[PDB]
């Protein structure tokens, strides 16, 4: 768990979540384009598409609105630039029917595109219902990499505001108390 990730504010279904980069490391790997770097950070997870740069994300669950569609806005961000960096391409989802040590790092067509990948520094996953609470996962993408310029942007801090819109939400709802402790552990804004 990243200890620098904290809930700044929580009012009804609106939430202010702060991300801070913790223990960012780079592992050198063998590739066709030479030595490439596999980035890693506390609570960082690689869900990058096969052949696209390995740019780990941090995900957190929030108790959100019961009827409306949520939005995520970056209210505060800070980054540093790392030049002439070769970021390793993703191997994608590997099956346990395979040996990952025998799977090579293969660069996709995305490595010829002059733009920053993935593009967004903050996204929302599809809304879900956990018994009596409608939840949604907020994703921080603090590693943005342009493969053509070999420039890596390291976001040391990202503050997002997750709020409801005027739009009706997907997967919307509508005594037992046993799931209260589940809600507290799943959602970082439930007790607030």
């Amino acid at each position: 768990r990243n200890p620098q990730v904290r809930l700044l504010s929580a009012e009804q279904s609106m939430s202010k979540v702060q991300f801070r980069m913790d223990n960012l490391q780079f592992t050198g790997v063998q590739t066709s384009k030479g030595v490439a770097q596999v980035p890693t950070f506390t609570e960082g997870v690689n869900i990058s598409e096969k052949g696209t740069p390995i740019l780990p994300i941090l995900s957190r669950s929030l108790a959100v609105s019961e009827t409306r569609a949520m939005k995520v806005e970056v209210v505060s961000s800070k980054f540093i630039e790392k030049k002439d960096v070769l970021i390793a391409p993703s191997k994608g989802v590997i099956s346990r029917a395979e040996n990952p040590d025998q799977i090579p790092y293969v660069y996709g067509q995305s490595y010829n595109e002059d733009k920053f990948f993935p593009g967004e520094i903050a996204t929302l996953s599809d809304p879900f219902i956990l018994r009596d609470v409608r939840g949604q996962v907020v994703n921080f993408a603090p590693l943005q990499y342009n493969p053509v310029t070999k420039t890596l942007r390291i976001y040391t801090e990202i503050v997002v505001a997750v709020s409801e819109t005027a739009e009706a939400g997907q997967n919307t709802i509508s005594t037992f108390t046993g799931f209260e402790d589940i809600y507290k552990s799943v959602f970082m804004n439930y007790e607030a």
Binding site: T40, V93, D101, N171, T175, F176, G178
Partner: protein, 423 residues
Amino acid sequence: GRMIVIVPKKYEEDIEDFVDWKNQRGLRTEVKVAEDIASPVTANAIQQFVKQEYEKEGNDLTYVLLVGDHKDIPAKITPGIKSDQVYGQIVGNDHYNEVFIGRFSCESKEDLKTQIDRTIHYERNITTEDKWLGQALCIASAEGGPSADNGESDIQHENIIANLLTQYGYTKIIKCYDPGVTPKNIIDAFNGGISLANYTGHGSETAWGTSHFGTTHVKQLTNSNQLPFIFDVACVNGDFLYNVPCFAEALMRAQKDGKPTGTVAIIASTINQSWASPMRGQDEMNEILCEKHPNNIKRTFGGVTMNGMFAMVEKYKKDGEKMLDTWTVFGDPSLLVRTLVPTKMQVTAPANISASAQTFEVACDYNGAIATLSDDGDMVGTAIVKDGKAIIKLNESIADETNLTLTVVGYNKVTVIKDVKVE
């Protein structure tokens, strides 16, 4: 909460002692004959029944135990998915379960009997003399690297789990890491006595890639009522739809001279597993198991594993969802897991109860313990021990009764059972 046991008509009389015990220990348990839902039993019919039972007064349905192999109660089949877990996905078009699903997979009356007997023995008959508890087995392949969860190899991943268990109180960790693990290494670990096993590597429908321990070596196990529960990260080990009993089924059905051997519970995949997402799930399972103040649901095998798999969806999305659906619970989902050698509880209760009584006071030195009054498997009342006492509120008249059964269960405690005379 409450549990529903979905049972084929041929096994209806056989689950009677199991249902008695669950209600006796404080968990409201009802039976539904599978053929009364639909005949033949289909996945779609099970879904609409579980959904309609969930929507009944109180909205307290928490566990569903499926009895029988896939021919008796089928798993839901969708492209690349074989699932029992989807039956618990009732509210919302998502993979976040409302209800914990478990299965007593059986092809004979003996297969069911041994799964009932091992569950009741584990919850009711474990004592301070069960010294095989607080001992864990960590198994790992010689593969994994930067592409895995937290950039850890299966050995690095299992070593972190081993440290977490030791910190919590596990007195012994047996490490079986590739290369060179043999089936004898696993047989000896089981026979020596273990209460938990963690596996991270490759699998086949009937065996572990690391060790080559499988269904054929299960007859060599002599761990009579010394059964671990397993968090299994391997492909198809839980494919109970296979033409021969799968790895998880052989361990749940194992018997030696009429005594249960193998496992008390196991979570294993019906399909090939991804590399990273199940590692996250396995970590969270062990972390929830090693929590100091969790709820009674997070004290059950279903609750521990499902809450562990929630983090997997949060962090790995669609791939994590695919793993959650197929990571099948073999055994009782409401099984009160044991992690260490139990300690005794000090339980003080009146020898008699008034026929016109509405409450029953029980003094207990363990706060969080569940005290329950029952009448031959019928729950009369249940209460949690808070500030050293439990005040059991009677939900029915006992005026005509002669005796009542008092059962006190506690996390890592020896179960207390007392008779209460009705005056």
